[PDB]
């Protein structure tokens, strides 16, 4: 079980770890988060009490280092940092635990929500989407734009998701215009899976990461990316059977975890209606269709 200690909490902030969120008052004696499950990526995120503008946070994996949070009064945010001195860190953590100044990541997940949301998400892939090689962890916030959004500005702060564009030469084989536009299997299976992502696990990892940035930070480009990766599968007549079954499990847990009051913004009517009711795979997403019907039948 790993720990992310906090130097202090000088400004009133809502702190979330995974799908859990808690409020910390100004200068409250808060000194971090313990009992974090090993073996998964995690995200710690922040919304200040005084400016709900800018949700921001950090993706990390405690196997890759000892990480802590410290408020910076110049840049005005909670920053993640790495402590290289292993014994300085265990000592900090041990003393904070002894004074019981750390909240505990909750132990029971009867439905393992977090595993199911991050099953294919790896740190190494996150670090290629979010480029900042001097740090082992990755900063993301509400306002960051995607490479594709930038095409249609600062590249050092972009989300480098894989570009998907259904009316592009990459998507459409010359001479197969109609075939490839109405059945995107060649773009899914040959261009993206075999060529770009190499396997479906990596495709699913980017799809899951895009969803999580959309949900936790309201990142619009990430929501665009999540829906495009869904639509590319649902609009392919030929999809490996293991992928379709896994996709149903993936989307089910994403829809299950979504705030009920955010479905007006984070869910794209057109994509979901086409995917569940018109696409080639309209019949291959029973659990996702079941939970979308019993939870957002308005959208449909």
């Amino acid at each position: 079980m790993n720990t992310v200690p906090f130097t202090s909490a000088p400004i009133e902030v809502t702190i979330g770890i995974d799908q859990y969120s808690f409020n910390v008052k100004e200068n409250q004696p808060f000194h971090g988060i313990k009992d974090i499950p090993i073996g998964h990526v995690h995200v710690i995120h922040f919304q200040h009490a005084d400016n709900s503008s800018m949700r921001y946070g950090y993706w990390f994996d405690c196997r890759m280092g000892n990480f802590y949070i410290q408020y910076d009064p110049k840049d005005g945010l909670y920053k993640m940092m790495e402590e290289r001195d292993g014994a300085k860190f265990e000592n900090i953590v041990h003393n904070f635990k002894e004074r019981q100044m750390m909240v505990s990541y909750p132990k029971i997940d009867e439905d393992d929500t977090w595993y199911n949301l991050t099953e294919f998400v790896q740190m190494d892939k996150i670090r290629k989407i979010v480029r900042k090689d001097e740090n082992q962890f990755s900063y993301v916030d509400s306002s960051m734009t995607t490479v594709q959004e930038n095409e249609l500005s600062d590249p050092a702060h972009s989300l480098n998701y894989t570009v998907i564009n259904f009316k592009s030469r990459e998507a459409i084989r010359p001479g197969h215009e109609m075939e490839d536009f109405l059945d995107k299997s060649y773009y899914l299976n040959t261009v993206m899976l075999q060529g770009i992502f190499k396997n479906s696990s990596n495709y699913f990892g980017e799809l899951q990461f895009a969803f999580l940035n959309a949900m936790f930070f309201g990142n619009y480009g990430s929501s665009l990316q999540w829906h495009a990766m869904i639509e590319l599968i649902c609009s392919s007549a030929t999809v490996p059977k293991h992928m379709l079954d896994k996709l149903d499990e993936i989307l089910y847990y994403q829809i299950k975890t979504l705030p009920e009051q955010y479905s007006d913004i984070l869910l794209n009517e057109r994509v979901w209606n086409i995917c569940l009711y018109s696409s080639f795979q309209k019949n291959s997403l029973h659990n996702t269709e079941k939970i979308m019907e019993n939870k957002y039948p308005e959208l449909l």
Partner: protein
């Protein structure tokens, strides 16, 4: 964006453009099978591709053999239209290629867009005008060449005959759309008006009769009456 009443003069500027109408590409007669069920039999169609400034018409004839053994023909027709328009553009010298293509029906946008991916600087535009180009098959010479075709074939016409020697493109397009709107609303009356006087003929190299300027005014006025009429006969006004 979309072409409408507000930006109508843009059709006659010096940027090359083409209208594409696909309404006569897939044509059928619906009939009864010996078992009493209904079947369609296709007849020859055409893509109507028109330069509104010069009157040049690229009439691509769509022979019924193109549908043999194909499914979902109304959807295929849109993609066949876009394939043939893209082939026409690639056949033209660069300085003759259009800068815009305006489709008369919005369902042609994605098919044409995908076939023209190689041409990123050719704008594909819908329109809010309800143009009467479906009535092109009421022009006897165009109908005749479509029905007689035994293979795929491109035929070139000038739909303005020699009008541009005496009138502007704006005025010629207005006359054309009036004639076609009349043929669409009441083809019989329209054709009666155009041929009523046996002394005005159609030149072998023309599509319409050789009216003097004065006779065109008379004709145009008779066509307006017909259109308003039918708009009464229809609506009872």
């Amino acid at each position: 964006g979309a072409m409408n009443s507000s930006n109508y003069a843009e059709l006659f500027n010096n940027d090359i453009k083409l209208f594409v109408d696909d309404t006569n590409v897939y044509r059928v007669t619906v009939h009864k099978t010996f078992e009493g069920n209904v079947a369609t039999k296709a007849i020859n169609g055409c893509i109507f591709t028109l330069n509104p400034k010069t009157g040049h018409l690229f009439l691509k004839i769509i022979h019924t053999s193109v549908w043999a053994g194909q499914k979902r023909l109304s959807q295929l027709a849109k993609w066949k239209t876009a394939e043939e328009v893209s082939a026409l553009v690639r056949s033209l010298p660069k300085e003759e290629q259009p800068k815009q293509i305006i489709v008369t029906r919005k369902a042609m946008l994605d098919p044409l867009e995908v076939h023209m991916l190689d041409f990123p600087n050719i704008a594909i535009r819908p329109t809010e005008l309800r143009l009467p180009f479906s009535a092109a098959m009421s022009i006897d010479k165009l109908s005749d060449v479509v029905m007689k075709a035994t293979e795929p074939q491109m035929v070139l016409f000038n739909i303005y005959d020699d009008w541009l020697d005496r009138i502007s493109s704006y005025t010629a397009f207005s006359r054309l759309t009036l004639l076609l709107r009349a043929l669409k609303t009441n083809e019989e009356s329209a054709k009666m008006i155009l041929l009523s006087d046996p002394t005005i003929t159609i030149k072998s190299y023309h599509l319409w009769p050789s009216f003097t300027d004065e006779q065109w005014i008379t004709i145009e006025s008779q066509m307006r009456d017909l259109i308003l009429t039918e708009y009464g006969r229809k609506y009872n006004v």
